[PDB]
């Protein structure tokens, strides 16, 4: 470098060490002054990092170099200067540098290796040498570079690289060992699978080198290695098959050794558990996995209240978790996670082997562990455990009264957890055992913690319990809870209100009885602490819905005044209890809520207009942004961004409320429609960083319109604007799940707006969208390994609905546009995948409903007649509907296919009368009825397919046909077929039936309804003439 340039830069870089003023002035000087100067700058920084005797200037420059060298980018730098930079970086690497500085140099060096950069064989050479050096930092830094630039591993000969790693795993220095494992795993996460087989063979050497960490007593470094192994399990789990037992035994050995700090024990646990989420068949196919996993998690769940046998510290604290009980927390999460993926099929057996034993221990901690374990495993093992339900209770319930309060707490938990997972059946089956068990823990005999948790478990039970079931226990429940309501400890009171609220909600009208006593108790609590009052307001309004409007009107005025007071006073936890309550009041009050809207809607507008709160961010500036629970950072296209997730979630919650206020208030909400639509709903579709927002935007739209319509041109303008943005969204939306919502949104918009609601260029734009959607679905489904083991159907289901909706609004004229995507539709018709076929068949049925299709008759009836006898009942359904619709709307142009296939329909009609294909065979039934109308032995067949109870459109026709077959001694089957249809709510046919009964004796007539029970005879009386 020119001599002047040096001291200019040397001054500036020295200004970087320091104060804000001197350091910002330098920052500006660099960003303003230093594309004429980039290569000078790069050259300078690289020299500093390499040769400066000043630690800090060196580090800084190395860091700066790295940053600026991506930004450059390095590709566009002069070959002449690249070479010089590369050489000085390399010279510095090989000289005498502080450990931290070699790390920084390494990372700068990494920025000078790129696929399209000129070859740098000097680096390879310096690495190969460095790996052999007796200075650990040389070895460590070399693996590091291979971690950043894994492609360098391909550049080395295989017979050099393999020994390099085997030496790596084995090295004297722990630091080197961790870097080698990191480099090894990094290889798999940066290279394509085609390259994996090439390092794969090393896994053994790595695994074999593990026990050495324990020998040297270097478990903290072991944890780091376990973490890299955990990544490799996500990438290539199969690779561990057949060394499987050796890692299982080893993790077992580590977790059991309980004078290891927890890090090595919890990461070893994670390693174990992660296999179940990445290779379930492998885990299932080894008896030893499930056995070790269960054994090991049970041991860990034992590690509670250490140095505190009485649990004194725990009784005194609140019902939040002691997150200092780390290994216990990890163990239950683990058991849960594994149970979920492997099922009870696989672990009931081993689990119970261990439960039986610990339930009866003299160590309380073990009796506890047993409860917590069952509780953690219950969801996952639902499949097996739902039928060993009394067995569970028999083991659990004895402990409800255990000497030790934490075992009691534990017992309450299982009872609660079980109530949820095995619902609704457990409510029906075990109320007699569960409710007394829990209710008995409410009494002040028991400790605060237990009382509260028993009350918690009662919410779980109540959610899915019938009012009828709960009724006998209510007085008992209520009296006990009111005691807790008077508790001294905030958390007991809070839980008592929430338990009351949720019991009340379940009880409905059976809670009317208790309204008078509870409500003023509640009002006094309110008049007297945020969560308490909010939980109280929640309880009050849940009770209010349970009892209905009239009854709730006894206190509603006062209640509302309190709400207002609460809303407008000086925790954001309360805001939500308030919001939910106002909303619950509107469900109670119906139209009477309207005067309240100007209190309630303005804060919701503000929240629901929050912008996409985004920070275009820098590499290091992310991990600290990630510290916040309220934030998440992602990468869009290499360049990263910080998105305020909490805020965006809040916007959704606000939108949901605006949407339900609109749904309940209908016409009354009209005043807001313009503002919500243009300032909330529509802009929300452009929220590419959060799909909840996008979705809530879409679902809002048709409900908005429907509100304005019910009140009353602007409606047309809005609808045009909205439908257009939805349509344009169909092409730009990346998530298929969202795409579905847009279609569903359009369908509902169309249903609101009525006839011809769409312009020609709209229709054309919708078709490009539909085409792009069908194209993207095909490409995803043409997907389906050596190392590894409904959203599409739902999307297509909706696209069928939107197409039908569009055809209907255009009254046919969309057929023109529909011709453009017939190639698409055709490919689908004759693919293999039954999903694409069903889609096409359903489109086709829509086309025929609107004799102008002959163009195509010869193209799809071959496939439809195939489909008729398909193994797949959803396919038979689609096909037969097509044939039915053919004879109905296109009678002469399809007479030739319809009548032949008529035999097929008598055959398809014969597991027909099952639930799973009741759907299919009902369409066939209707299809033949349609043919018999358009144009005698056959019609007698048709009758033997009544009644139609599941499909509404089918049923509609069959009984219209049955009514014509009459007006122009099967009598009890005739009547029954009809009674069944109405009773099953599937579908004047009655007028025809009456006439038939007219031609009979009073006594013959009456005997037909001998069969029917009271409840349906109440209905029969009210159906007849």
Swiss-Prot record:
Keywords: Acetylation, Cytoplasm, Nucleus, Phosphoprotein, Protein transport, Repeat, Transport
Main location: cytoplasm
Subcellular location: Cytoplasm; Nucleus
Keyword Cell membrane: no
Each HEAT repeat, start to end: 3-34, 38-72, 79-112, 121-148, 158-190, 199-235, 243-278, 287-342, 344-378, 382-422, 424-464, 467-507, 509-547, 550-589, 591-665, 668-711, 714-753, 760-810, 813-850, 857-889, 897-935, 936-967, 970-999, 1002-1025
GO biological process: mRNA export from nucleus; protein import into nucleus; regulation of mitotic nuclear division; regulation of protein desumoylation
Modified residues (Phosphothreonine): 791
GO molecular function terms attached to this record: nuclear import signal receptor activity; nuclear localization sequence binding
One cellular component term from this protein's GO annotations in UniProt: nucleus
InterPro entries: ARM-like, ARM-type_fold, Importin_beta, Importin_rep_4, Importin_rep_5, Importin_rep_6
Keyword Coiled coil: no
Biological function: Functions in nuclear protein import as nuclear transport receptor. Serves as receptor for classical and arginine/glycine-rich nuclear localization signals (cNLS and rg-NLS) in cargo substrates. Its predominant cargo substrate seems to be ribosomal proteins and ribosome biogenesis trans- and cis-acting factors. Required for nuclear transport of YAP1, NOP1 and SOF1. Mediates the nuclear import of histones H3 and H4. Mediates docking of the importin/substrate complex to the nuclear pore complex (NPC) through binding to repeat-containing nucleoporins.
Similarity section: Belongs to the importin beta family. Importin beta-3 subfamily.
Quaternary data: Interacts with Ran (GSP1); interacts specifically with the GTP-bound form of Ran (GTP-Ran), protecting it from GTP hydrolysis and nucleotide exchange. Interacts with RPL25; this interaction is dissociated by binding to Ran-GTP. Interacts with YAP1; this interaction is dissociated by binding to Ran-GTP. Interacts with NOP1; via its rg-NLS. Interacts with SOF1; via its cNLS. Interacts with histones H3 and H4; via their NLS. Interacts with ABF1.
Protein known as: Importin subunit beta-3
């Amino acid at each position: 470098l020119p001599e002047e340039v040096n001291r200019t830069l040397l001054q500036i870089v020295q200004a970087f060490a320091s104060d804000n003023q001197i350091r910002s002035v330098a920052e500006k000087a660099l960003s303003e002054e230093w594309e004429n100067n980039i290569e000078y700058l790069l050259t300078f920084l690289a020299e500093q990092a390499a040769f400066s005797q000043d630690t800090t200037v060196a580090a800084l420059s190395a860091v700066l170099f790295r940053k600026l060298a991506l930004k450059a980018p390095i590709t566009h730098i002069r070959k002449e200067v690249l070479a010089q930079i590369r050489s000085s970086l390399l010279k510095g690497f090989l000289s005498e540098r502080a450990d931290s500085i070699r790390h920084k140099l390494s990372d700068a060096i990494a920025e000078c290796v790129q696929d399209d950069l000129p070859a740098w064989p000097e680096l390879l050479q310096a690495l190969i040498e460095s790996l052999k050096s007796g200075n650990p930092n040389f070895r460590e830094s070399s693996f590091r570079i291979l971690t950043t630039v894994p492609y360098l591993i391909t550049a080395v000969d295989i017979n050099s690289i393999l020994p390099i790693f085997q030496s790596g795993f084995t090295d004297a220095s722990d630091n080197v060992k961790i870097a080698a494992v990191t480099a090894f795993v990094g290889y798999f996460k940066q290279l394509p699978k085609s390259e994996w087989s090439k390092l794969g063979i090393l896994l053994p050497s790595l695994l074999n080198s593990l026990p050495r960490f324990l020998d040297d007593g270097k478990d903290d470094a072991l944890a780091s290695v376990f973490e890299s192994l955990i990544e490799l399990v996500e990438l290539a789990p199969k690779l561990f098959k057949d060394m499987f037992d050796q890692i299982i035994q080893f993790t077992d050995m580590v977790i059991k050794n309980k004078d290891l700090e927890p890090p090595a024990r919890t990461t070893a646990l994670e390693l174990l558990t992660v296999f179940s989420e990445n290779a379930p068949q492998m885990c299932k196919s080894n008896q030893n996995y499930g056995q070790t996993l269960v054994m090991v998690t049970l041991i860990m769940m034992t590690e509670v209240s250490i140095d505190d046998d009485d649990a004194a510290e725990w009784i005194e604290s609140d019902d939040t978790d002691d997150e200092e009980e780390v290994t216990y927390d990890h163990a239950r999460q683990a058991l849960k996670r594994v149970a979920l993926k492997l099922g009870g099929e696989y672990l009931a057996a081993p689990l119970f082997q261990y439960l039986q034993q610990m339930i009866t221990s003299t160590e309380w901690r073990e009796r506890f562990a047993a409860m917590m374990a069952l509780s953690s495993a219950a969801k996952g093992c639902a499949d097996v455990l739902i039928g060993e339900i009394p067995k569970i209770l028999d083991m659990v319930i004895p402990l409800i009264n255990d000497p030790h309060p934490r075992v009691q707490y534990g017992c309450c938990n299982v009872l609660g957890q079980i109530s949820t997972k095995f619902s609704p059946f457990i409510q029906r089956t075990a109320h007699d055992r569960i409710l007394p068990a829990l209710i008995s823990k409410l009494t002040s005999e028991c400790t605060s913690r237990v009382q509260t948790h028993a009350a918690a478990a009662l919410v779980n039970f109540s959610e899915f319990a019938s009012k009828d079931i709960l009724e006998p226990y209510l007085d008992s429940l209520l009296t006990n809870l009111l005691v807790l309501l008077q508790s001294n400890k905030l958390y007991v009171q809070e839980q008592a209100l929430t338990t009351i609220a949720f019991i009340a909600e379940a009880a409905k009208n059976k809670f009317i009885k208790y309204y008078d006593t509870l409500m003023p108790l509640l009002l006094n609590v309110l008049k007297v602490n945020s969560v308490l009052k909010g939980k109280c307001m929640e309880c009050a309004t849940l009770i209010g819905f349970a009892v209905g409007k009239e009854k709730f009107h006894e206190h509603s005025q006062e209640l509302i005044s309190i709400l207002v007071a609460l809303q407008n006073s000086d925790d954001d936890a309360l805001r939500s209890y308030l919001e939910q309550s106002w909303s619950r009041i509107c469900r109670i009050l119906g139209d009477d809520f309207v005067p309240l809207l100007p209190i309630v809607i303005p804060p919701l507008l503000i929240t629901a207009k929050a912008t996409q709160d985004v920070g275009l961010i820098e590499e290091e500036e992310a991990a600290n942004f990630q510290q916040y629970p309220d934030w998440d950072v992602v990468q869009v296209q290499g360049k990263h961004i910080a998105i305020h997730t909490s805020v965006l979630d809040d916007k959704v919650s606000a939108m949901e409320l605006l949407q339900s206020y609109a749904t309940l208030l209908r016409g009354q909400f009209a005043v807001y429609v313009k503002e919500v639509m243009e300032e909330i709903a529509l802009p929300s579709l452009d929220f590419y960083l959060h799909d909840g927002v996008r979705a809530a935007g879409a679902t809002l739209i048709p409900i908005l319109l429907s509100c304005l319509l019910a009140a009353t041109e602007e409606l047309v303008l809005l609808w045009h604007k909205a439908s257009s943005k939805l349509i344009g969204g169909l092409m730009s939306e990346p998530m298929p799940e969202i795409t579905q919502v847009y279609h569903n949104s359009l369908v509902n918009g169309i249903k609101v707006m009525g006839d011809n609601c769409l312009s020609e260029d709209q229709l054309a734009a919708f078709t490009k969208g539909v085409s792009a959607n069908l194209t993207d679905t095909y490409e995803r489904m043409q997907d389906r390994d050596e190392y590894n083991e409904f959203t599409d159907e739902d999307l297509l289901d909706e696209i069928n609905k939107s197409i039908a909706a569009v055809l209907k609004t255009t009254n046919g004229h969309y057929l023109k546009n529909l011709e453009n995507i017939w190639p698409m539709i055709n490919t689908f018709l004759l693919d293999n995948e039954p999903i694409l076929v069903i889609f096409a068949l359903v489109v086709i049925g829509d086309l025929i409903q609107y004799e102008q299709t002959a163009s195509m008759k010869n193209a799809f009836i071959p496939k439809v007649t195939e489909c008729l006898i398909s193994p797949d009942a959803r396919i038979r359904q689609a096909a037969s509907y097509i044939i039915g619709v053919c004879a109905q709307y296109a009678p002469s142009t399809y007479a030739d296919v319809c009548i032949p296939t008529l035999d097929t329909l008598v055959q398809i009609v014969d597991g027909s009368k099952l639930e799973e294909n009741r759907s299919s065979t009902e369409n066939a039934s209707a299809a033949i009825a349609k043919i018999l109308y358009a144009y005698d032995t056959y019609t007698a067949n048709w009758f033997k397919t009544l009644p139609t109870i599941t499909d509404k459109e089918a049923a509609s026709f069959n009984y219209q046909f049955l009514s014509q077959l009459i007006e122009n001694s099967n009598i009890s089957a005739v009547v029954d077929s009809v009674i069944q249809a109405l009773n099953e709510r599937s579908l004047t046919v009655i007028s025809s039936v009456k006439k038939l009964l007219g031609f009979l004796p009073s006594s013959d007539a009456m005997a037909i309804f001998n069969r029917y029970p009271a409840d349906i005879m109440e209905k029969v009386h009210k159906w007849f003439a």
